[model samples]
Target: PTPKYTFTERAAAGNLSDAEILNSNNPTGSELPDESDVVVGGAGIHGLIYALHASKYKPNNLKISVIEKNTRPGYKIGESTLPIFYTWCKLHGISAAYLLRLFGLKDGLCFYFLDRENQGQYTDFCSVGAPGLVLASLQIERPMSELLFTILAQRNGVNVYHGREVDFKSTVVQGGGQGNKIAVSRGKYDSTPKTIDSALFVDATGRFRQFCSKKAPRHRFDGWNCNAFWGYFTAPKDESKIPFDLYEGDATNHLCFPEGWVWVIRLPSWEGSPIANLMDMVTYILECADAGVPGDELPSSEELARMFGLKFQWVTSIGFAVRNDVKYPEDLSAYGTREAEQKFNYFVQKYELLQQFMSNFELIENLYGPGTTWFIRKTLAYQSPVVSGPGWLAIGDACGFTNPLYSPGINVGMSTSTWAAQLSHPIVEIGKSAPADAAESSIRKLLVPYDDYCKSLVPALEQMNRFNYVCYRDTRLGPQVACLWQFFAGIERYLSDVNIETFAHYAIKWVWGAMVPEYQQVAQKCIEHIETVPLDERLPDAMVDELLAFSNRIKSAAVAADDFSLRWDAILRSFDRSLNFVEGKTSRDIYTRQCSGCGAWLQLRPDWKKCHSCGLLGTEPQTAVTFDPPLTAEEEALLYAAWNTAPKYDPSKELKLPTPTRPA
Candidate 1:
């Protein structure tokens, strides 16, 4: 029998009634506020979240108004949450039960690599047994999350205005008492223009980048071009391809292919829905080069199932990416045109297994391609270097964006917006009393530190993202696997900084610098080189060779004794207090067990004494002993299964820290 796990911890004492959540800060059916302390453009998740956090810094006094173009928050991407993000949500009043009830809980990440030589064989990287201290995170559907957050923001005293669009071209910023003025058009259905005045204006308009699209300097991440084609599907009843038990459907699964990779996310089942049992979503991505097909060119659902070895009941909302120059039919239906549908049906008829699930298959939305353009975009400055001027600031994609490979989009948005809001508290509190010069200076002073914080953080995250994406292309699988373990292990350490484990925190930073070239520095060189090259031009063979060389260099650096020691030492020093260690010894082998309450190491001989560490009386050998031993036969076999089959890189020779020299 499977053991049942239950959670009793409350985010707060009681649940909020729907009336309390929706009516508290809602501006629905109300006239738009003529003025506010803060004006947020675009009521997307990031914008709404910023308003929520900003309200915390100023509380009831902060007259925050969010203007959004959409009639309602619509479905969007980015459903996965990391441990850090989950904690952030909790801190902002989101509860675990709320998440579990509305969405799916994620155990960890799972990556499956298809064998290039073998037709259907594959190997996977996943954790066994139980997860560690981080606890489980969540996978959510965006539409639901947006509404929940909008209400949460309203409850926190933020005024949310749906169906309103901002006109950036006509906006003007002024100093001191006059404040900033921007013209906004009413919803897409109604375009009555209204002027809004705010003491402070924030641009959270996302990729449209309202304020900074033209004002802020921008740079593209060179040599990084990737696109994705994603849609939802009804999964099989007994999805045996996923190794864990049904109870542990809390993992983000990845199916890796030669051209790129695919993300398989499990969603919560809806009651009264067609194909209610099959609620998994998959996003097929094409990275490295632009070789993805158009909507009309997309293969049949049967072909896709056969290719990935998964059965699907219904495939809905299909979209893809193709080269800019090569146009394909964008209006292709889900099952294609009549002729195309006939062809697809023929393809389905050929597959006996597909026929079983095709009975309930139906299209829910229109099919389209070129879903999004792939470009490596970065803020020349943090959230656009001058995210703040006199009376305005930019947050979210409006400010800037790095790649989403590492899933830091939400974390960055939340942390930076909180920081920005906190810094702006005094400025907003000053009201109209302060002189224009003083107010401007105060704002500038706040922005300087915010800029420094962004610079300090974002570049490193970008490097980590680039490293994760590029590592997969390495000729050797061992380097890829080993490097990924180290990389993600470092990420886990970095995210758990709230524990105040300073040594581990900085140790990971040192590991990043030692293992890879400074990302921004390398990116500059790539930009300089690519300027002479065309955007559509395929990467030169030499450049490809050099990229692999860099990957090899990073792999070598990861396994280096100095780098390895830095990580291991930090782990031992943080995990146990009484741990004393030789330079290269294992933690369990070298360190003695200690009592948690008294904080004293257990002595070898039996004795009862007052603990020196905590001044508490305790017996000798105060805690259970943990030791490192030779692997058992079964453990050895498991290790062999994991590592031996993965290809090893060339002769184990030391490669020096690589320079950002021009590729090839």
Candidate 2:
């Protein structure tokens, strides 16, 4: 059984009449109104994201009830959003303006590859990234963001209930006059349960899977299963102390070790966030005037930090992602020990960037309690036997999960939830107008694409994620693999972030083509190369030239005709290669990086907004900025010159980072 999370301790007691239950935040799960259009179990981001999405698309006056087991769904796991998350938010009617307040700006992904030849020194490393922020992503304060999502969902007319456990047993009552409605029980398992009826039931219970896991078999991959150890840390007083610039600091930071890698992501910390609501800033100012306490006895550092009040901005999420393959299983064992903090320290000291940056910050206690320094998870790779069935559906982690090394977890969740939200409402409405027996099959036919899509998509993505682990182990061949994925992701980001819905679906279709036999052949060869061959078999200069040219053919082939709408046609036409970046540094560097907007064009500047002015480049303490649809005719023409098949791309346009001179 999955160990209980933070919210289990929050009380479920309340007093509300059955009629009053559907309109407001119901404390006790004891009562149920006659019916609602949709009933969602669990109020974490997945449930709320679905509820809010369902609120907008649902038929007139239909109600969405989000029942959560805990009074407040405290931070569970997610802290970052890939570009697709914002795209789903836009498609589902969630406002970016509100999202900005809850999240800090995220630039993009930065990878620091540790050097192998020189005793695995941190400074002896190569960095991988694009020149500009051409994609959409967010550095979210997950716990509060969910709270905000709850309020917004409520404002939009979704019935939300906290402190109620959604019972696992779903009673599907058929042959009713209206149609087939599911009678789902709610409240504690040991106690008599309250029930509600709805056309569709969503199992957004994440890892619990509440409803569908029992009905379905769980599947696991051979070596893709991952282990993680992560925690939140208080931001240092001055943010500049970190090695990255303002924009890069906000991006996902990955520092590697021999075992796996470490990720340090920024959250809204400091004075501007909801921490003010938790405690009076002025009152705390007086109480901690001399670093004193408000209570009779002084609490220690962890409690004092809590008493100090936490804003979304003042905190950071840092953790590890390790592939638990048999070869390196022993490497990950130390992280779960009683002295995990010491282990983290010893590892950090060897990495200069982490060593210098961590000097100003300290590990924070889990929001629900203190003394626990790390939150750990063993099964990072798993999938449900099936994602959906008749009258029932799954979303987010409830659907399944892949490795987070590339930050695809939330993307998968949003994709499943949004696609289900978009499709389920139409199916429900269709049932109203058609024959009870006939509509079931008719509606289910529409789901075939979704099921097949999930089936094709997750394994492909899991394969893409596997590339990162090999990158961690093979410093020589790794960056080449990283470049290949970067190119693949660039196309994906554009397809997802663009306003046209077809392009969004095209993103999934794009992955289908990406995982075809040709791409698989390329990836498998490298996997075999890393496993069978010795690390230093090839010389550095010889190795660089060999792997660098391996996939460049894919790059040129992708841009053959430049059909902006079906940009991913390259994979079908042929898989495209990724760009390498930066003007300075040695181990490995790339001079050409693509824009986050088109995901297909070259970028000259490192700033987020310069090329195509996509939605991702906003400054901190965010102000609303107008975003272009991203692929207007002007967008298509501006970068045509850069394509291999185009007339000419001016080199002077790109802003090159300074490079140190080196010669034979």
Candidate 3:
């Protein structure tokens, strides 16, 4: 029998209705326009997103052109989508139908932990459970998504130039006594190349670091000593034959080895083609620089195949994927050149059974192969003079990136672009009509909040990245060393199979209410106020001391409450009932609870501490705290009003089943 729920059927189940999905296709390949309000360099996802968002804030129609070196969009790296990115796409007007039609639904993330002693065995590791808050996340093929984005940007009135090489001359002053302008020469190899000028220029050039290359300072992330290998392949049909299950091939499967980790994601079928006997696959191979291959430390193709547990009889040959600039040795005549020789030698040395297995099976996509040593560098955060300056701003990867372990690149890019557009639009409007001083003042108004938000994000990103790296290095340490309260509070929802609405309610109390904010403020202030710390700066000794003290205090509290396991479920129930009663889904006063200290009819705990807030206790007991009476009539009414105003979860858009592709 044919499969009951085909991939398309399952995808359409939780996606947007016909009315919401927009018709995004539009033409590209327009020549450079003379002058524009904003000129974004690089026509990649970030550049296009910046253009899309800037249009939203324009007081009047603004000319926006995105210059690109490639004549057509190329395959970019980021593929996995987190909940935050999903929400951003929806909010930014990328419809659910487009996503479902163009991408694969990522149920969640599943991991298989493999230690060295058990080379042949892999076991179930912790995984991020699904379905996400509103809908399931996505696994995107870069080309498809980029094409959609390009068309979307065009629909939003952005002039996208293809095969245009943007040469940044210098920031020159306008001759007619106006303001500054970026003097740029664009489009290569013409008798008379086009010269385009702009009032504001955005650096969305990503790793190319177009505008601020020399202006910004690069701070090395000392502990991030990892390199990765990635490629796309045609996958076998029955996932059951694979080493481990992937929950019906819906989750991003993580295969972990003592030395490093591998990420395997199932790609969508090519351009609506019928599946004959196989599916497409994308895998990322990551290992630390010190992962113990000889001198150069680049793992051989044989080593990688074994690491991947490819059975001996499966293939007859192997090859490696080499990048453009990768260097190789000078002398091997048999393999023809240094590049060919290096890859061939690396392959022959690792798999002795290669000749016996078969003569033709080859491994390819050797990302960090011979002569390409330059590709391996520390992923670091760059220090900037300011996020926004007189006539420019930096967004996307150019703004500095967090570690890739969490796959936050697209999220950061889209998010920073959104905020940057919001901040810069008013400045652009004011600059158009007002005096220089007036525009500067208006720009200043947006700068502080923007700066604060951006700066605050850096500390959290750094700390979280550090926390994850440390955990990956050693899995035995407990919460004291890891500070897991922060993890559970901030990221736990993303790792659960909970509905978005329920997750939001729980997060309001657990995450925002009493968990992360309690310590985040302290940590944020400590990192922010400290002056001129180096990029690889260790967490300040003083900060560590403070954390240790705080952790010890929590330990003491745990000792006191040893008899009672924290009734987290009960707390969650309180949030659920409060939401239900407040949303008018229930008529009963579910929030009403008897005070531990006072005999009261009803009083909400935590957020509305009526029983505890009233000064009714004369003298407190050793274990007792003072009690406040129930809420006054006015306060109760205000509480009801607040609840009524809060956003309710719309079940109409919820996923049909929590985990649609769950394994048998």
Candidate 4:
């Protein structure tokens, strides 16, 4: 039995329908509706994920009635996943691998990061590493989830009552001589008044406020304000992969910045689909009124369009905006600074940059190896409060939401679905053949652990988010990032011993490392960035030089750290070199034992658009006309003479950051 997270006595006073029913000594559960083994309310991704989970444990016994207001099952949400969630998907026996392959994401694209100058680029990918975590991620193709779940739900015998708005007053109650009666007004699917029955009721309606209002005593978080706005677009042709910016997916593959980051993932569409988001702790427009480019001065719609025409390469842009005022798991007071004005402005600016970069970032995969950008969005999760009631359970966005930054919504939903699915069968078996008391106890026992599990998850997630945010924002020498890095290397260490207590202990240990001088300085820079003013041309040269020097130092430190990391891994591998040595020998024998100047040659043409290796200069043979022809021998000689020496054969133009020719 998992330990219960006992809420404050004051909280207990609130109307927690499930808690009340579980604790009540009544003969019946609630005076709503009841009949089938499981009545899943809502048809969001979570419900589908839960249903999938049920397929494994309660494949036959469970009868789930998925009540969705929308005609389609999964239409609203987007897919984003963490690698760990993929592991959960495998556990659920969900054919994620097959789906990933079908979606052509087997060898996924790389991710990159560039500065305002587009001069330097960083990617969440590392070329040196073997296929890192590319194939497994939360990003999905497109709106195909609805179709995927429709087929699966029907196959699994999960009854989906789409286009039905459900009422919360109804409950899943066991009937008399009749099996079980689910009491509900038939006002959902039809305007007529009627009653629908089911043995169990589960809410999977994502972001539907009606059910939440009915079951849980909903209240707006007093001072919490985390808002998100997002949009999607069809990207430009050259946005995919850029030259010299190729790498396997890893932590560095996804470009990141303080405040918020964006993600660009590839969809199944030939025209690259991109999603971008701007997330902030609060509605900062009021506070940061000054930070915004002044009214009239700000780019108008037309101006913005013209400007983006030069910057972004979007064919069509579909956009949606949402703001979540409800706080589910954590308190926001920790982030509420007394200087709200300054902080708010900083957040706005940071997110603004994130939005501009990601929204405009195409499928192009340069800054690593030239490739198209897949898809990018901020990593954020959004989870709703209250999932289970008398005979109901919630899944997907209805259960909770996650930051879209990591894009784990669909993945977590699927994982939760697995758990939900597992709990369904036992209850169904009890409803059929087990003794009344024994059945009730069995069903309660099966679901009780899950309740405890979610409770524990809240704290665990909070800690995890805090750890990650610290690492992301505190760029210098943050212990949180280092600890997280180590944790990523060995997940078993935490997962095997997962618990709030254990997490707390680990978090404390990691925090200690962040307090060191080097780490503290990095953390300080992050703070300074938040508090500082814009760098204008009027600033003194000495001040600029000092800032540059500091930046250089940080870069050097980061390089050293990267070098140390690689060496450490290599040192550890030394113990098992025999296997590697043989493998190396096989590779060398098969490929090349000695250097043979047999490198391939290519023309430096500008009009070859075929996706293949090209000239030594690594220029994409584009569809555009060549403005400059290849230099003749005499011209080349004269040019080289003018430069004092022969021009270095730059196999690839080693441009650190893209210049004006390429927009940032």
Model 3: residues with Cα > 4 Å off, grouped in runs:
1-29, 57-61, 117-133, 170-191, 245-248, 257-260, 269-386, 475-487, 491-664
lDDT scores of the candidates, listed in order: 0.46, 0.52, 0.43, 0.36
> Among these predicted structures, which one has the highest lDDT?
2
TM-score of 3: 0.57
What is candidate 1's lDDT per residue for 545-645, written digit by digit as tens?
55445544543443442322223332332122212223333232221233345222322212223332233445545222222333355753453353222
lDDT of 2 at 481: 52
TM-score of each: 0.59, 0.70, 0.57, 0.50
Off by over 4 Å in 2: 1-31, 58-62, 90-97, 120-136, 170-190, 237-247, 269-313, 326-357, 492-507, 510-521, 533-546, 559-664
TM-score of 4: 0.50
Residues forming the 10-long window of minimal summed lDDT in candidate 3: 276-285
Task: Sort by lDDT, best first.
Answer: 2, 1, 3, 4
Residue-wise lDDT of candidate 3 within 1-664, one digit each (tens)? 1112222232255462211111111232334566777777777777877777676545346777777775445556567776555654554444222354345555544544433332344444322322111233676766556555665566567777655666665544231112545444434444456656666677788766777675656544443334343434333333444545332355565544322344556545223221110011101111121122221122222233233332111100112222222233455565334444344444333333222221222343432234432122323344343566666677777766654444556754465676676555655676787777767666667667655655555545666544433322222211232323332234333222232233322222221111244344434333343323442233445654554465445433433432322222222211121111111121111222232442221222222222221223222221121112234557545433532222444666442221112112
Candidate 4 structure quality by residue, lDDT tens digits, 6-97: 32222246543322322221122222224456666666666666665565444565555555555333224354444344444433333222
At residue 286, candidate 3 shows an lDDT of 13
Candidate number of the best TM-score: 2
- How far residue 99's Cα lies from its native spot in candidate 2, in Å, is 2.9
Question: Can you write out model 2's per-residue Cα lDDT over 230-323, one digit (the tens) per residue?
Answer: 7778754355566533213555777654456888786663333232232222222223323423221323222323444443234667887765
lDDT of 3: 0.43
Which ten contiguous residues of candidate 2 have the minimum total lDDT? 655-664
Clashing pairs in 1: 107-250, 221-376
